[model samples]
Target chain A: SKPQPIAAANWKCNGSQQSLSELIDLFNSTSINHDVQCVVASTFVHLAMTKERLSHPKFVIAAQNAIAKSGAFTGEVSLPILKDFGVNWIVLGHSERRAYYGETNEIVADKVAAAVASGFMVIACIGETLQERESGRTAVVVLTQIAAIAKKLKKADWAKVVIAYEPVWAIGTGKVATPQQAQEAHALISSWVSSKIGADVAGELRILYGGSVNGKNARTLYQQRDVNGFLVGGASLKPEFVDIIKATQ
Target chain B: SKPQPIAAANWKCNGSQQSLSELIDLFNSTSINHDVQCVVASTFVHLAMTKERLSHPKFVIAAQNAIAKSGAFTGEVSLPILKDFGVNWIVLGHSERRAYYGETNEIVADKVAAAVASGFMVIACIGETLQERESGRTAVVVLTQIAAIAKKLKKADWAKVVIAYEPVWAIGTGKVATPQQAQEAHALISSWVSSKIGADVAGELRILYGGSVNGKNARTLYQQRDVNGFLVGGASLKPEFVDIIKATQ
Candidate 1:
């Protein structure tokens, strides 16, 4: 698989330049696996600084989100502006955005389509909320979220996508899916892609596990067949993020 | 009169580093009125660069938006993060945010309160839509918008707030508010503040007119007693923005 084993750190709304620069130093001092593709998603304000301070070639800079189109959106950061800051990856449809900011499945898909069409890689996040999951609607919800993006994208566009399944219940709650739970969810997602799109893409697509991912559980989760990478949350800002990256080795 | 005649540019989802640097060069080369406080509100990606490239002591950098609180908000830029980037001003509650993003008056007021409490100046925008204006609901709508912020703020906090009246219909459209129309709206807003809050705060407050403001119309709008400043839109990225700044003289 071309883009497998991606270890992405989403600093979320946390991190100042001084703290982030030190985190960069920590990451730079640690040795990570060469095969693991690493991504650091910073808030819009710190992207330029993150890109400038990061020393490793494998460390890619990503924006937490991007506006689908350019122009006259008073507070939105457009894709062109992200690109201008040397950001090649965008993390779209994070649960925080969906839950707090009203980013629906359609809006997420539109953002993914735009980012992909503009030649940027995307970590397209998808998942069910606690209520949906409690009601056994996880598959129903995640599939609908994926289908929205799948409908808009060409079959070839799947190559540029790394799907990040971040359940709303688990994110920032110190709750993580067990290895079996993570694998089962990833398998469900992959099988859906195989049947809906094509087996070739399903086999090739890198599905990432997100939600309270940390150094302790990263290796076991990484051992799952379909758990190709991670979309880290809180642990992303810590030194243990490097341990999670090294776990993918 | 201390902070009167402010000239602000909302580059709104526009500008690359190279282009914005050139704009800054133009601003630095031009002679602007010393009494006119200038602010450049760039999209999140460009704020740092805008601050770095800008050379004038009178010119300040502002973020087009900010999150009310810090932590766990994946895509939103927090006020602390903006502060880390050396941004001291935040343009909150812009019409685009209210219309497209579902920022209610309550949410906007919360943002203004947070920004002010965090020791940052705010250009708090209030506006009515096309239908509202057509239906003669402009006064009702605008007063309600301002009242929400006034409810959340202390009387002293009014000193840190700059009200920007940007009618949603006129923004980005070629429709300019004639000087008389602009004056009436500003006067209505000012008189309401005087009656509701106190005469001292209302008289000292700087209410800036926005929505299709340009160099050609800046002087006439500035001549209005209640219109003390401007929050520019498209022309903010152009050479004539200098003319608008000079018009404040």
Candidate 2:
């Protein structure tokens, strides 16, 4: 099984024409090989520019999230629209969306179904909250999210799905999960995924850690074979993103 | 004090390069006057084009909704970024957000403050659902939303905020709010707005009647003094939007 490293940037709500040029330049000029893929999940406003400026064989454009359907889900980007814009991937069920926008395990599953049904690569994000972890419910929370996806998705849908584990506490709290902590969670997710979908498919799956990922901690996080890649956030806007891109490579 | 009617279109999650050109052409050629201000609420993807192609003294651009703040909200648009893009107007607290994205009165109010603090004109949406309306809670629902804004806003903030009354049930059911029903809601909202902001300010304010606002219904809806203009959805994507722009004229 070929599992090239993936460095996916979630630009969040940041960037304009001016700042996008810098990020695009980084992707266009980043010293990464075909063995490591680079993806920038930009806001809809910046998608075209990212596609135009950062178009590369080693690069692909992704939307941070997408609504389940195309019709009248106002303030949502549909998969078809993303497909029309040449976006080949989507990051569904981010913590921010699950928490703030009320995307439930079921809703994320709906979006995952939409993403898979549309034939796009799916970054199905799952993780435990600080309280959930405190209560030792980390594995349960992650398992529930994955289980929901399993309900909505077909057996073939597993191929395009990549699990991104972003623990609520570690994200944007300036608290990077210890390399071991990230791997522990990853190991839990893999086996549980194995429980539901056979160990063979579990080993083949790509599960990226998205816990305060930046240049400094990326190597340690990715140093563990359990940690396949990253869904980089705030750091994605800067040149340091390249460092994280080169981490798994 | 003179008040210009505002025909602002909420394009929702729809529009493409092909359709946007046609829509922009209508705005560029619409026979609307200064007495009736024309605005378009575009998705982020089309903001550049809306700002570019519809650069008319007769027109202004509006964001569908902005996150409450300018920092760290991933996959969310911020007021500062909207402003940086030369977008001086934003539509906040649309019913879709309130229903689908879990935007509370509190969150909507926060976004109102952000919009005001950023000095952008706001088309603040507030209305009732089918359930609430059936329970005859329309006034209560509408007033609650208004009261929340008043709690967070300066008295002067009322000046830049346009009230867009989007009745939830009427949106896409092919069931337009009857002229009387639309005006009744608008009238109730106007008086309620007057209760807090005063008759002087309310008299000078623009309150747009949204939900299935089309050319045929625009005149009837706007005929009531209470119904000033429209925050059009689907029709805004068509040439008929021009007729709605000139509805009251």
Candidate 3:
């Protein structure tokens, strides 16, 4: 019923107060597409300040990640804490989190369940590394990646989720994938959803394309059926981020 | 030679705006010991607001933990990010971090080195678990824990460091060590410092005792010679945190 396009910015572990101020100025000044869903995935450090700084009605603030639950994960931010801070979105299972911190499929599933249960939107990220992709194991990896999370999520939960297809090799390396590559990966993911969660859920679910999405390529990349939007990284910090936001138009 | 002692609050994964407000009210009302250094080792969500709201001069802010260095550690805060936020201190190698997050001796050393390189003070924590303590391996465990950190630190860096001894069994169990237990553990740690960094650095270096520290017993714990201050946990959120800050007097 409500299928607006999605565009999110994951700053990863970047941003300080001064730079966030600079970022906010450009974001607030830009004539972004009001119909498209826009969000800035911020470091926990900048959550409060960014929420205050970038107060556009249509703009939402996202946390890069959150813990499965509270307490045991020391120095880890909790889902409730993010919710209390006016953070409506969470980005989970980014390849960096999985590769470096050992956020396995089980843990990411638990985190999504926790966030979704508490009425938070989750940009659930799943992607294969260069090695996995090259081995032609991308489909199984991505499908198995979602299987656990899909098991935990309800049909009600599906409405609050967006899957970001971030190819690990392409992230922050300026290694943009060809249009064929982006659509192929996303279509495989969308098909997995149809087989498992039904076509209605698959048809409604917005599969996003991440990995080096920039203004130059965002328009053509956004033209694909399964590529509903982006989870932009470094380029999101630049002033020209507005160009990508308007790519679907 | 800075004679001032240190008291830090490790809020772990707790607090929201309302609780933070209540916390700031107590913190702002309390007349803290000017000669006793006060720092709140906070969750990243509370760091900026805590720094801004609890603006006591001698009091500073801390991140419960940070990454050894910068990026590639997603959902991880870095030393520079903490520094940019005016965070004066960092809590490294707490038992929770070691046990739950797989923070090993080498990793904690890297974190301390990074924090020190960025001109940030570190509350370097070391302690034995119930099993280790029962086996009478506290001395060896704590000593080996500190060895890696000491190897990377210059003599000057010791001045910016305060060691916290928090027995894993005692944390959140309402089971505080007796004064003798607290002093014995602290003295062992102090002896390690004297042997490793020289007696002068050891004596001048303040050592803190954590685990089940609250207002009712704060004074007795403060009386221990090697017990320089505290790394207050649950009690840190209560009104009695102020009492612990004033415990030395």
Q: Rank the candidates by TM-score, best first.
A: 1, 3, 2
Query: Per-residue lDDT for B137-175 in model 3, tens only?
Result: 988988998998998989888988889999999899999
Least well predicted 10-residue stretch by lDDT in candidate 3 chain B = B67-76
Pairs of residues at least 3 apart in sequence or in different chains that clash in candidate 2: none
Q: How do the candidates score on chain B by TM-score? A: 0.97, 0.95, 0.96
**Candidate 2 local lDDT, B174-237, one digit each (tens):** 6789988987888888888788779888898888888888889888888787787888888888
Q: Which residue runs does candidate 3 get wrong by more than 4 Å?
A: none
Can you list each candidate's DockQ? 0.85, 0.57, 0.69
iRMS of each prediction: 1.0, 1.7, 1.4
Q: What is the lDDT of residue A189 in candidate 2?
A: 85
Question: What are the runs in model 1 whose C-alpha is more than 4 Å off?
Answer: A1-3, B1-3
Q: Quantify all predictions' global Cα lDDT against the true fold.
A: 0.91, 0.83, 0.85
Clashing pairs in 3: none
Better-scoring candidate (lDDT), 1 or 3: 1
